[PDB]
Design a protein around this ligand. Sequence first.
Ligand SMILES: *[C@@H]1O[C@H](CO)[C@@H](O[C@@H]2O[C@H](CO)[C@@H](O[C@@H]3O[C@H](CO[C@H]4O[C@H](CO)[C@@H](O)[C@H](O)[C@@H]4O)[C@@H](O)[C@H](O[C@H]4O[C@H](CO)[C@@H](O)[C@H](O)[C@@H]4O)[C@@H]3O)[C@H](O)[C@H]2NC(C)=O)[C@H](O)[C@H]1NC(C)=O
Ligand SMILES: *[C@@H]1O[C@H](CO)[C@@H](O[C@@H]2O[C@H](CO)[C@@H](O)[C@H](O)[C@H]2NC(C)=O)[C@H](O)[C@H]1NC(C)=O
Ligand SMILES: *[C@@H]1O[C@H](CO)[C@@H](O[C@@H]2O[C@H](CO)[C@@H](O)[C@H](O)[C@H]2NC(C)=O)[C@H](O)[C@H]1NC(C)=O
Ligand SMILES: *[C@@H]1O[C@H](CO)[C@@H](O[C@@H]2O[C@H](CO)[C@@H](O)[C@H](O)[C@H]2NC(C)=O)[C@H](O)[C@H]1NC(C)=O
Ligand SMILES: *[C@@H]1O[C@H](CO)[C@@H](O)[C@H](O)[C@H]1NC(C)=O
Ligand SMILES: *[C@@H]1O[C@H](CO)[C@@H](O)[C@H](O)[C@H]1NC(C)=O
Ligand SMILES: *[C@@H]1O[C@H](CO)[C@@H](O)[C@H](O)[C@H]1NC(C)=O
Ligand SMILES: *[C@@H]1O[C@H](CO)[C@@H](O)[C@H](O)[C@H]1NC(C)=O
Ligand SMILES: *[C@@H]1O[C@H](CO)[C@@H](O)[C@H](O)[C@H]1NC(C)=O
Ligand SMILES: *[C@@H]1O[C@H](CO)[C@@H](O)[C@H](O)[C@H]1NC(C)=O
Ligand SMILES: *[C@@H]1O[C@H](CO)[C@@H](O)[C@H](O)[C@H]1NC(C)=O
Ligand SMILES: *[C@@H]1O[C@H](CO)[C@@H](O)[C@H](O)[C@H]1NC(C)=O
Ligand SMILES: *[C@@H]1O[C@H](CO)[C@@H](O)[C@H](O)[C@H]1NC(C)=O
Ligand SMILES: *[C@@H]1O[C@H](CO)[C@@H](O)[C@H](O)[C@H]1NC(C)=O
Lengths: 460, 52, 52, 123, 123, 123
Amino acid sequence: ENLWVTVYYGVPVWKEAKTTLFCASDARAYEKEVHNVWATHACVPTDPSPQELVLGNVTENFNMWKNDMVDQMHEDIISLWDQSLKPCVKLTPLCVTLICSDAGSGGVEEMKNCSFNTTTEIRDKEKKEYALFYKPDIVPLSETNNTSEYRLINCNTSACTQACPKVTFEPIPIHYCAPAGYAILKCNDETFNGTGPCSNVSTVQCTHGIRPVVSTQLLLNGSLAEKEIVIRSENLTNNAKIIIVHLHTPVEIVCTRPNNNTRKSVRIGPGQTFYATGDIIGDIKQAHCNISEEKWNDTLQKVGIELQKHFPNKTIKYNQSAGGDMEITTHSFNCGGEFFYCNTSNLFNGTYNGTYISTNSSANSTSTITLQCRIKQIINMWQGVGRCMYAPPIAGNITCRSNITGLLLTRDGGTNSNETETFRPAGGDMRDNWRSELYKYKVVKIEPLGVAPTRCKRRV
Amino acid sequence: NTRKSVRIGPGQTFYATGDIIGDIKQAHCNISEEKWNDTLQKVGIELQKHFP
Amino acid sequence: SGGVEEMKNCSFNTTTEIRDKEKKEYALFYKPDIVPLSETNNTSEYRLINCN
Amino acid sequence: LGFLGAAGSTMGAASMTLTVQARNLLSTVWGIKQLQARVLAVERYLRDQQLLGIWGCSGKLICCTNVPWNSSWSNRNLSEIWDNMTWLQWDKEISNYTQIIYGLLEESQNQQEKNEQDLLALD
Amino acid sequence: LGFLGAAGSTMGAASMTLTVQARNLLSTVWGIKQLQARVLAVERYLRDQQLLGIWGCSGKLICCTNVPWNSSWSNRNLSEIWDNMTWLQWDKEISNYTQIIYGLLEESQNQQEKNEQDLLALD
Amino acid sequence: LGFLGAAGSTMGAASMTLTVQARNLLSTVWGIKQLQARVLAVERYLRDQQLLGIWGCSGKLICCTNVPWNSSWSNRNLSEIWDNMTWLQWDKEISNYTQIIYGLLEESQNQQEKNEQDLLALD
Ligand SMILES: *[C@@H]1O[C@H](CO)[C@@H](O[C@@H]2O[C@H](CO)[C@@H](O[C@@H]3O[C@H](CO[C@H]4O[C@H](CO)[C@@H](O)[C@H](O)[C@@H]4O)[C@@H](O)[C@H](O[C@H]4O[C@H](CO)[C@@H](O)[C@H](O)[C@@H]4O)[C@@H]3O)[C@H](O)[C@H]2NC(C)=O)[C@H](O)[C@H]1NC(C)=O
Ligand SMILES: *[C@@H]1O[C@H](CO)[C@@H](O[C@@H]2O[C@H](CO)[C@@H](O)[C@H](O)[C@H]2NC(C)=O)[C@H](O)[C@H]1NC(C)=O
Ligand SMILES: *[C@@H]1O[C@H](CO)[C@@H](O[C@@H]2O[C@H](CO)[C@@H](O)[C@H](O)[C@H]2NC(C)=O)[C@H](O)[C@H]1NC(C)=O
Ligand SMILES: *[C@@H]1O[C@H](CO)[C@@H](O[C@@H]2O[C@H](CO)[C@@H](O)[C@H](O)[C@H]2NC(C)=O)[C@H](O)[C@H]1NC(C)=O
Ligand SMILES: *[C@@H]1O[C@H](CO)[C@@H](O)[C@H](O)[C@H]1NC(C)=O
Ligand SMILES: *[C@@H]1O[C@H](CO)[C@@H](O)[C@H](O)[C@H]1NC(C)=O
Ligand SMILES: *[C@@H]1O[C@H](CO)[C@@H](O)[C@H](O)[C@H]1NC(C)=O
Ligand SMILES: *[C@@H]1O[C@H](CO)[C@@H](O)[C@H](O)[C@H]1NC(C)=O
Ligand SMILES: *[C@@H]1O[C@H](CO)[C@@H](O)[C@H](O)[C@H]1NC(C)=O
Ligand SMILES: *[C@@H]1O[C@H](CO)[C@@H](O)[C@H](O)[C@H]1NC(C)=O
Ligand SMILES: *[C@@H]1O[C@H](CO)[C@@H](O)[C@H](O)[C@H]1NC(C)=O
Ligand SMILES: *[C@@H]1O[C@H](CO)[C@@H](O)[C@H](O)[C@H]1NC(C)=O
Ligand SMILES: *[C@@H]1O[C@H](CO)[C@@H](O)[C@H](O)[C@H]1NC(C)=O
Ligand SMILES: *[C@@H]1O[C@H](CO)[C@@H](O)[C@H](O)[C@H]1NC(C)=O
């Protein structure tokens, strides 16, 4: 009849909290003798059995535009990029005035020759060297129309750090694990619009594999969706918030290149040797990307038929990116250590007015979309705090038979009496990639102590 | 006047004094007189407890 | 302006963003920052005080 | 079965599954984060065991005490509490007074153990 | 009562504030000092629990043992030493005489454990 | 005796020296190495104490259980073990059969735990 306090160890209650997180790689990356810019040895190996448990009758609130795991991933990748360039060759002597002409006989319309002078093993004497530099890396310092003088582009802001030519930029998967005494709530609802309640919450220690690919528009390799094309956005009222389209089926994409000679080893000091592009053997062709026609057309048509839920009585259009410099408006990625920047006018040239147009032609698979596109070497990513990288070139031809997962769209500022709201592509900050991978997860703290009244009383 | 920005090396910036606009005047610091005098006298009367 | 008496002008040459070329610049350094280099009797070969 | 196996079930069903919940408590740039996480895991486990060990309930999943339950904390009968609530909401209206609960339990333990010492020294 | 709420009180008053004093033994240039402080606090508390668990008194605030008290350590009666002096003066008196007390406790505990082992193996 | 004072001695002297070998389980770039060594030492001791705590032998140096000893693990006489052996080759003999021993001890303590659990609420 009386009530007494009783303690319980094992009470399942949660608190919203933030904590530092692990890294869980696999054993297959543990055996390689080369170290990539991420970690293989530093991460703890994971057990080959993901313990997943489903909760009975819980409904949990979820958010992803205010998350902590996204910021921790962003800080981890920034710190790894700034840490993998410490024992590397600093190309501070590559700031000399460069004398450049056409690229030999039969000009390539991509590269300049740009022969400079450099310091030999004696501080006094100098020797003449030649290289090949890409056009976006070269800027004509001038006071007149003197077209014979040029300089390197990163001898104006900061940095001048060369990447170490034994690491790889390959995106191996990394798992995130919470420490002991914490857990991760993962929402398995297929129609998750980004915020709000979820009703199939599962408790997971170590998240699934995340590939840290880098892409401004047009998301590369990643986890697919479950049932249909899904729209994620913060508000869908203002046009400043980047809208993320997540696809159900992938579209193949390939990107290739003509030949180069090799790394031409140029020595600039005691034990400091950088590898600029030497000769080019073979003819000169343009680097490009290839996408199948009908796959892209009906993928964008599926995005059209699903995107009309939030805009019921309006037609949708697409056009190019809305101006700026080349580093933001273009689809940028890396393959084999070479950085590609690509013009995407041919992909976003179309509209939908509500009439679905089915296609049935098995002999019309020859039609493809090409993308005429360029290659830089001096890299200025993360729009700052970047430690500007000079990626050394790669001798043979390179092929990037990739996969596609998502799109990063934005809405143009609409006008009155309009039924033709257009959607452009946009890049921006790199938080959107890992926000489009970590929509499922939320880190949480368990409190295993509880108190409750009951009829039990301790003996005296 | 200003931080005139000289550029040295590959991206190092050194900030120096540029012009001077207006006349030249001296850099001073002002203390109140009587507050200093009676604070000094209070230190004096609290310092005669040790020295007789 | 001929009447400062605490800061000198101290024009020099310096390395620009290209290490081949040099350019002519000026400042206004304070007087205790500067010591004369006594290689002659000329009072115009001044130097910064931290250089040794 | 592992963590949080009855996280949305009723309060009375949670008492029969406590043996499986409190099991996993100890089992460059990616070394320092691992070290900080390991240190805070050790700190969390030691804090929980120390707080369980002050008021005489060490090594027990369910421990009964001898402090009366004031009606100003919950003011609700036993039946609907033990058959209607999940643990989450009950923790929400006890979290305002858990400090007073902890202090009363600590003082009750000290009084009980001093009484035990006096009873043992009587002989 | 606070962290040192009875530092000048008598033995009979300071033996009741044990439970609100033992609760607080666990709760970049300036991001490594905090980590070192965390680890040394954990080591101190674990050393104390190691020293308590050896003579068979884990989880007890006040511990009654079976070691006879040699008169050469105190040469004093009980009423004035429990109602006159504080913990600091008594600790200052006994601070020379601690290691032999700890050794006597260890020997008596192992003897008691072997005796209980023999008695339980007799059955 | 001192540290490792009876490592080669027989089983009879080994039970009189357990209380001293549990003393010494606790007592820039090199700074992180020192913190790594310290945190692994404290974590190894904490896992050891938790492992003693799972099968109901926490605090006690010598703990008796109720698991029946299967003869296929040893096949040796009782007085042969306790009067003609040191701990080392005994460890080499038993070390293949450790996980079955640990699982049997854990399930025996689980059995005693549910016996206590349904004995507390049956009076
Ligand atoms: C999205 O997902 C795709 C699918 O995996 C990724 O594409 C892979 O990209 C990597 C590089 O980023 C490719 O790896 C490279 O393959 C080249 C060709 O390999 C063929 O030839 C070798 C023998 O030379 C065979 O063993 C192999 O099986 C193939 O038949 C190699 O030449 C490359 O080697 C270079 O690197 C190594 C490691 O440093 C050096 O030792 C070598 O000397 C050489 O320099 C490299 O191995 C991989 O082939 C691609 N996969 C496919 C299926 O083509 C995308 O990268 C990924 N991300 C993005 C953003 O798209
Ligand atoms: C870039 O210019 C250099 C010289 O400034 C060229 O190197 C010359 O190549 C010819 C080949 O016919 C040799 O005869 C010369 O001796 C080379 N001069 C050197 C090494 O100083 C180089 O060929 C030019 N680049 C390209 C792609 O043609
Ligand atoms: C040094 O960098 C600055 C930027 O910090 C350059 O200034 C602009 O650069 C862009 C990119 O080429 C040009 O389109 C603009 O015309 C530049 N000027 C302005 C006022 O925006 C600057 O050009 C760089 N130095 C040299 C010599 O090119
Ligand atoms: C470095 O240079 C300073 C500036 O001249 C020297 O300091 C003077 O030294 C002479 C000789 O001892 C003194 O008479 C002066 O009083 C010093 N001060 C100034 C303002 O002239 C200094 O000796 C030099 N050498 C060192 C530091 O080893
Ligand atoms: C580079 O160094 C050589 C060294 O002999 C010198 O002759 C030449 O004038 C320098 N400048 C250029 C632009 O080649
Ligand atoms: C919840 O997710 C699991 C994952 O395997 C699935 O098996 C289950 O059917 C899902 N339940 C609901 C109600 O969606
Ligand atoms: C953003 O959303 C909130 C509520 O979801 C709304 O009140 C607000 O008006 C939205 N922002 C804009 C610019 O419309
Ligand atoms: C895309 O943007 C350009 C920019 O001026 C605009 O002229 C055009 O009408 C837009 N739409 C299409 C379908 O090109
Ligand atoms: C991309 O291509 C279009 C047409 O092919 C062209 O007008 C445009 O200048 C190109 N570059 C960028 C950066 O859009
Ligand atoms: C877009 O497509 C139409 C027809 O498919 C074509 O005429 C046009 O040149 C393309 N490009 C642009 C920029 O409109
Ligand atoms: C380019 O590399 C790919 C790698 O698979 C190869 O198949 C192709 O033949 C190469 N191109 C040429 C022209 O050799
Ligand atoms: C991309 O799609 C192809 C086609 O099914 C598939 O074989 C490939 O595995 C996908 N890429 C990844 C990284 O899974
Ligand atoms: C500084 O450099 C300029 C040009 O390089 C030169 O004319 C001058 O003589 C140098 N020395 C001084 C003291 O100005
Ligand atoms: C829904 O919650 C109740 C709690 O009263 C629980 O008994 C029931 O099993 C839950 N439903 C399912 C399908 O687990």
